[PDB]
């Protein structure tokens, strides 16, 4: 009964660990999007700075 719980817990630990990798991927996707957006704003700002001169 203890060994079956230990096996079971080990299965769940692996699932937990796997979920974490999925989340890593999510974080990188979000970080990429956030970054691309910052870039857009920066490039627009520089075009407007130019047009104002």
From the list other proteins, Cl ion, none, pick the one residue 8 interacts with, judged by a Cβ distance below 5 to 8 Å according to partner type: none
DSSP assigned state of 53 = -
Min CB(15)–other proteins separation in Å = 9
Q: Indicate the length of the chain as a whole number.
A: 53
Binding of other proteins at residue 48 (CB under 8 A)? Answer: no
Residue from the set 17, 50, 51, 52 that interacts with other proteins by CB under 8 A: 17
Helix (H, G, I), strand (E, B) or coil at 1: coil
CB 39, min distance to other proteins, A: 5
């Amino acid at each position: 009964q203890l060994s079956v719980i230990k096996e079971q817990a080990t299965e769940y630990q692996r699932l937990s660990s796997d979920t974490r990798l999925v989340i890593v991927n999510l974080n990188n996707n979000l970080i990429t999007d956030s970054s691309n957006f910052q870039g857009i704003v920066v490039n627009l700002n520089s075009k407007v700075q130019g047009d104002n001169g």
